[PDB]
Design a protein around this ligand. Sequence first.
Ligand SMILES: NC(=O)c1ccc[n+]([C@@H]2O[C@H](COP(=O)([O-])OP(=O)(O)OC[C@H]3O[C@@H](n4cnc5c(N)ncnc54)[C@H](O)[C@@H]3O)[C@@H](O)[C@H]2O)c1
Ligand SMILES: NC(=O)c1ccc[n+]([C@@H]2O[C@H](COP(=O)([O-])OP(=O)(O)OC[C@H]3O[C@@H](n4cnc5c(N)ncnc54)[C@H](O)[C@@H]3O)[C@@H](O)[C@H]2O)c1
Ligand SMILES: NC(=O)c1ccc[n+]([C@@H]2O[C@H](COP(=O)([O-])OP(=O)(O)OC[C@H]3O[C@@H](n4cnc5c(N)ncnc54)[C@H](O)[C@@H]3O)[C@@H](O)[C@H]2O)c1
Ligand SMILES: NC(=O)c1ccc[n+]([C@@H]2O[C@H](COP(=O)([O-])OP(=O)(O)OC[C@H]3O[C@@H](n4cnc5c(N)ncnc54)[C@H](O)[C@@H]3O)[C@@H](O)[C@H]2O)c1
Ligand SMILES: O=c1[nH]cnc2c1ncn2[C@@H]1O[C@H](COP(=O)(O)O)[C@@H](O)[C@H]1O
Ligand SMILES: O=c1[nH]cnc2c1ncn2[C@@H]1O[C@H](COP(=O)(O)O)[C@@H](O)[C@H]1O
Ligand SMILES: O=c1[nH]cnc2c1ncn2[C@@H]1O[C@H](COP(=O)(O)O)[C@@H](O)[C@H]1O
Ligand SMILES: O=c1[nH]cnc2c1ncn2[C@@H]1O[C@H](COP(=O)(O)O)[C@@H](O)[C@H]1O
Lengths: 375, 375, 375, 375
Amino acid sequence: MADYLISGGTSYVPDDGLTAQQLFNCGDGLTYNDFLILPGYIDFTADQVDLTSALTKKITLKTPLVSSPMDTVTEAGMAIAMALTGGIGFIHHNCTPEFQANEVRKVKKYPLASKDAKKQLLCGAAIGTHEDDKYRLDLLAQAGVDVVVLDSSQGNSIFQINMIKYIKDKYPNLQVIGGNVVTAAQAKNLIDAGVDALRVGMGSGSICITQEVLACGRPQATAVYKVSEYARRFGVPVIADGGIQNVGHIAKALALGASTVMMGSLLAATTEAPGEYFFSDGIRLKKYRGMGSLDAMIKVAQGVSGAVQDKGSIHKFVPYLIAGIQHSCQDIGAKSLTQVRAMMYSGELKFEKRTSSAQVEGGVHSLHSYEKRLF
Amino acid sequence: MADYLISGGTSYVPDDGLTAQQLFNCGDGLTYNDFLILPGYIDFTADQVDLTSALTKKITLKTPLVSSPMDTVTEAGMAIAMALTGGIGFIHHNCTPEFQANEVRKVKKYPLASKDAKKQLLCGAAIGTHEDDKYRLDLLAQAGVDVVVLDSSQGNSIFQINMIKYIKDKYPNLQVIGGNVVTAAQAKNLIDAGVDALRVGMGSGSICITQEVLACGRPQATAVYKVSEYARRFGVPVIADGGIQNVGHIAKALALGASTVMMGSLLAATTEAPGEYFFSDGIRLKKYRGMGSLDAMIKVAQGVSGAVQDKGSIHKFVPYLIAGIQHSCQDIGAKSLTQVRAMMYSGELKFEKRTSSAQVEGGVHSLHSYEKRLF
Amino acid sequence: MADYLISGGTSYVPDDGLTAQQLFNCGDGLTYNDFLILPGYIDFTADQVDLTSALTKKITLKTPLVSSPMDTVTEAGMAIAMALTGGIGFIHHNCTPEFQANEVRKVKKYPLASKDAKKQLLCGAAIGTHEDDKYRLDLLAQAGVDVVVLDSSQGNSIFQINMIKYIKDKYPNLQVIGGNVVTAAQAKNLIDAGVDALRVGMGSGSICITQEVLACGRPQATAVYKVSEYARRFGVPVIADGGIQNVGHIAKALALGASTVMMGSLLAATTEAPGEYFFSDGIRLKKYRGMGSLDAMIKVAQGVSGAVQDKGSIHKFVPYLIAGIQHSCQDIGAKSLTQVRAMMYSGELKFEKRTSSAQVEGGVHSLHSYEKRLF
Amino acid sequence: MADYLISGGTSYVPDDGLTAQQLFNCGDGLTYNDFLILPGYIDFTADQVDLTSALTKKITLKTPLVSSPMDTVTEAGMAIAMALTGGIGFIHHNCTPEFQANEVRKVKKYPLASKDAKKQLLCGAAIGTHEDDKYRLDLLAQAGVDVVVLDSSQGNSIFQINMIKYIKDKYPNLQVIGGNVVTAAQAKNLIDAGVDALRVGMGSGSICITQEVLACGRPQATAVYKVSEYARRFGVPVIADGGIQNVGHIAKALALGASTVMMGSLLAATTEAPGEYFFSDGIRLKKYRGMGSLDAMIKVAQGVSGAVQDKGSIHKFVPYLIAGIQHSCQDIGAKSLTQVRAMMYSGELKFEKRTSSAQVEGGVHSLHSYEKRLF
Ligand SMILES: NC(=O)c1ccc[n+]([C@@H]2O[C@H](COP(=O)([O-])OP(=O)(O)OC[C@H]3O[C@@H](n4cnc5c(N)ncnc54)[C@H](O)[C@@H]3O)[C@@H](O)[C@H]2O)c1
Ligand SMILES: NC(=O)c1ccc[n+]([C@@H]2O[C@H](COP(=O)([O-])OP(=O)(O)OC[C@H]3O[C@@H](n4cnc5c(N)ncnc54)[C@H](O)[C@@H]3O)[C@@H](O)[C@H]2O)c1
Ligand SMILES: NC(=O)c1ccc[n+]([C@@H]2O[C@H](COP(=O)([O-])OP(=O)(O)OC[C@H]3O[C@@H](n4cnc5c(N)ncnc54)[C@H](O)[C@@H]3O)[C@@H](O)[C@H]2O)c1
Ligand SMILES: NC(=O)c1ccc[n+]([C@@H]2O[C@H](COP(=O)([O-])OP(=O)(O)OC[C@H]3O[C@@H](n4cnc5c(N)ncnc54)[C@H](O)[C@@H]3O)[C@@H](O)[C@H]2O)c1
Ligand SMILES: O=c1[nH]cnc2c1ncn2[C@@H]1O[C@H](COP(=O)(O)O)[C@@H](O)[C@H]1O
Ligand SMILES: O=c1[nH]cnc2c1ncn2[C@@H]1O[C@H](COP(=O)(O)O)[C@@H](O)[C@H]1O
Ligand SMILES: O=c1[nH]cnc2c1ncn2[C@@H]1O[C@H](COP(=O)(O)O)[C@@H](O)[C@H]1O
Ligand SMILES: O=c1[nH]cnc2c1ncn2[C@@H]1O[C@H](COP(=O)(O)O)[C@@H](O)[C@H]1O
């Protein structure tokens, strides 16, 4: 009878909110803490949200947290902790090739464990783009790296396209990560070159000053939406880096179309981070450089050198991140991240822009003094 | 792997077209032959499209074609033909009450057959709104009418609300058809009164001049969309009358949210139409009056008296109408009318506005002479 | 110095007009005689405009005029005249398979000549979609047809995708024409199936009533723009049929992104058209049926049967069409049709919408009596 | 074949971003750090970007960095350093005429060297507008100044037009710099007066308070776009001053249509700056006054007096600025500044607006403490 015969299954569900296409075609450069996600319907508990998310076309992870190839964030002790909790790591290329191959060998021998066909835990390693970096890839492949990141500030070079053509005939089983891209044109110029997964976002890092120096980049959330919108046409996941201070930005990045979220500062200064601790004004903190900083080794500095206070160990930290992600996906109303992105591209999951006074009341306000403890 | 993990099930499906909400909020008064439906995907043959569509909250028909309570369109010989091919009829109230009760008795004794629980074919009968028309309803209920139409040019009266309150306590099993409404406010003021199904559209009849005389009404397709949009919130089907010359307007009316389509001129001058034929200039044609014409029996004329050439019998005519509806629902890409409306309200089924030169090339053009034969 | 150092090469060139993307995102359903092309700069004569335009991914023609597979427009005597003047023909499938294979054999044995590698003039032949039409393709391939048209009113069926998968492994050198499509979604669902060239436009034929009957289709010029916009992403030409009464609509269709223009009524009633002439009211005219008319051989009629007055022979007619196309491309300001489409997609070639009174003064007006002779 | 015959040369290149005309017609007053430039395609190294940019209609420089005629920024020791690294200087007019003529004589006798026909390095000198300043120009022409700046807060006076008419008949080979203009109307009222190059921007200086005092001016980037848009119609370069703290604003100013960038505070407190150093709270800093400050020599103050910490010498500083400009032009994707402006006015180079939270994450964030070293 009529209660099914008019529409069928779908109830009314009023039209409060903006969809993602309506939000990112107003022209404004929205970042993470500039919009938010409207809630939906809950019919499931929090702990039964599966965070299965693809890294490349062939590589699938159990949780979408991947780390960033920076010489103060990832080495072997980092990648074992990221892969052991279900993510993946990327050993930086700011060292000698035998050192990077040694560390990839170290992590590859060694619950949600993210292991390959031969039951060893996964590992990635970023390479450069210059001609001498073809020798690094042949040392990383002998140690058996599973995925490589063509680490560059600008991903639309003829050099990176030539490197992708160099990899996709000498190693047909190896997965490559093209980047960095922010616009859909340079997404096109890499997906036709054979990239298995893009890496979106330039300028919005916690240490990047390349928007302040080179006048280039774009706001982060618009990049994550408008590259993933193009990249799902060809079945290519994207990776969002930079701009993450908290678990809310991870949920926003996953909701806008990113598959995994790459984090630099939020995993910096852990126990598994390279380097060691030192004290400044009584606060235990570990230093955190950028790749384009002039502490890399007439040159321009696309980054700064700084320090971050510690946050303990990762095995007590990324459980908080994954628990925050499933609570956010509960309040959104989807049982998986795939269902989050399906509800977003289907127009069901609706967003809303957030003004400046709305931002300053979204946080902590109207208190004399507070202490913010997250877990 | 990634081909499911980004979106899942839903492919890309580019964003060509306007949805119905984007189409009917431009402000323009679009009618039937002023927009059209963009096609979709076919994975089914034409003849397996089921046209099951609700008439009221309790009454379900097998095909959405219902007839109009006009004294030159429906009597017993009409209603047996409409119910016998799966629709329903409405015996007009432009006669004495014993005549209408006699004809409803005649049709109720007497494939897709539209029969009740006691296996007799369904029948409706329109009543007035004045106080003496309470005696007509008590004669039609003794003959056992299944649904009644509160036939009025303006459906938001206190008189019609009082008649609905009079019916919904003396006959709790009887179904009522409130109308005519064109705006969502008078949809609200009847659905809270207890109407089982609305009847949308004033002024857009083939013989109505009440837009030209009383300056009231609205364009038909916008009425059918904006009342059905309100009426599906409460599980109330709507009926669209007027403006139909062809099977294309039936498909457009069903796609915009109407459940059944009421037709006056397209079933006028059939063999089962009341009256008899006469010849004028060698063309066999049967006359067709309007209810608000001054040939009803200081008064204003809300209708004209005219004539329509014949179209044979209904049992060879409504097979053409239902075959046109399933071909249109094939080209749209939905297996049922319920799926058509679900794709429309879900934003999947997309429309496009059509300009004046687009209308004049949509029909027949650039020929010396042609003959248009439909079946 | 500064006259080159500010911009370089590009002069000012003020911003009068609308680009094609700005024109076909206002939402309106623009057809051919509803907009027009703003002129540009001339630095070349008319006769040195080359009309080289691709039919499929592999087939290239010398002039973009192709004919339509209709049983009153194309047979062998038509296809020899179309191929002999540089176009191509498509022998209709409204006959027995041995008759169509015989006529394709007849045209394949037999200046701008459009010939293959073996120096015989090209020929196409439309096939159906049903299972028994697999036997027609194997008879047309023995006679050596160069391209086939999957002739259908709706090109997004599972049946046509299955036919394309059936052709693209049994005949890897054969070219297929998918259609008919009007929206970019069904362009996607065929280009991934392996179509070499799309055929855009439904409803806008000179004899189609399928917008008036099945409530489906879209205005023609918006279809030609929005499918070619999607189809040039994958290097797939499109073919525009219907809506052409004159050489102006051919120039508008080629400017919006179509590569070749398929014409039904404008080549009907020629000397090379099938059938024979007859007189009605003293005018020599030849009949012209539609495929969906009920004169094909419970069924709906998607077309009408009519007649067109004669226009002589093609060898005196298509020189007028190609001369009109190069005069239009002169006034636009591009030396080739490829340069027309490059100027259109680059935003250089600008358009302007045209209102109803602008249409009625664009034609002939303010005269007592006139005679319109075109060549 | 078809891969060239549809469009030709131009690939798809999706439509992500806003062009400059779409950006500066939203009405908002965008400045430098309020939008940014989307990247493009790289097929060239950084060091082969030529920064050849015109100063006037006749004067061409090798790098677009010019200095500002302020009595604490430019004297002879400044202009030799600016011209020696390829730019040009402007000796201020806040002194006696014999002193300015002496210093212009000093700089004119005395790699990318910016030299005239007689192989001496170029020099400019600003003059006033009052009647006694006609005597300054006749002393500067005897020492042989190559270009003069009519230094004024408002460039649309009858006084400055009379001075331009006074110069362009007594010195037909001398180049004049009209300014300051911010709107296209006062660009028109000077270009018809005979200006060889405009000087755009009022109020947006690092020491100007004339927006806070005289309620006049406009945001800087909109001025640089909307005067250069008018000025390239007549082949007139523009010079952008004020609002520059970094090399990113230089790249944004050059991308919006400026030919050279005039900088006041970014070259203040160098070794070649006039005056001498002093210490305040342990930081070596040199004072930096404004021309409209009441330290010029009932009057209103259009400027403030302040101080800037040192940045070393220019011969180690402007190599950083030019290296930042060619890295920015690499990431944009153009081999020259002329190609940057050609891609901008052609609609190829696309921009994007940047919100407030996008600005606060574009810089350094989420760190405990950092040190920002640029080279
Ligand atoms: N958030 C971001 O995306 C971002 C932004 C800025 C910097 N960074 C980091 O800063 C690091 C350095 O940035 P980068 O791109 O300048 O490093 P890079 O060494 O890859 O680039 C150096 C320059 O050389 C050019 N190049 C590439 N291949 C070349 C070749 N064969 N020959 C000559 N030149 C070649 C590049 O165009 C570039 O201008 C990167 O590792 C990146 O991770 C990241
Ligand atoms: N397409 C349309 O919707 C449309 C438009 C115009 C006319 N019509 C047809 O024309 C016919 C006549 O139209 P109508 O509405 O004027 O018929 P009606 O007899 O119902 O209305 C007559 C007038 O009396 C008023 N009325 C209702 N109840 C009353 C009561 N107890 N006491 C006093 N006045 C009362 C009504 O407001 C109306 O002004 C209708 O049967 C209708 O079918 C239809
Ligand atoms: N301008 C246009 O695009 C246009 C519009 C209308 C009609 N036409 C012409 O009208 C002709 C007839 O139109 P048509 O599409 O109905 O012809 P058709 O025979 O191809 O279609 C007949 C119906 O059968 C279905 N079909 C396809 N394959 C099938 C299969 N194996 N089994 C069962 N059903 C199958 C189709 O969906 C369709 O509903 C066409 O040749 C076309 O050229 C063209
Ligand atoms: N970013 C900027 O554009 C900006 C803004 C404010 C101030 N400034 C600086 O401040 C300095 C002083 O500004 P200013 O324009 O007031 O200096 P000014 O001496 O040129 O102007 C003084 C006033 O006299 C008027 N004037 C010009 N010629 C005159 C004449 N023959 N007779 C009488 N009056 C005449 C002017 O209109 C002005 O009101 C300028 O050197 C300028 O560089 C720059
Ligand atoms: O030196 C730099 N300048 C600008 N961006 C950088 C630099 N080094 C790394 N990045 C990017 O910053 C990301 C991490 O930033 P974060 O997550 O904000 O801390 C990395 O994944 C890189 O993409
Ligand atoms: O007299 C009248 N004036 C205006 N509308 C009328 C009149 N009589 C009937 N109608 C309406 O016209 C509809 C049928 O019109 P048609 O389908 O266009 O022929 C009926 O269902 C009534 O709603
Ligand atoms: O029967 C029909 N109904 C609707 N469209 C048709 C029919 N037959 C052919 N067509 C289309 O009409 C086109 C030619 O129409 P014309 O060029 O306007 O004369 C053909 O190429 C077909 O795509
Ligand atoms: O006194 C003043 N008030 C406002 N603007 C000034 C003044 N003096 C100089 N300017 C402008 O400020 C520009 C330099 O400012 P800056 O580059 O922001 O440091 C100069 O080129 C002048 O156009």
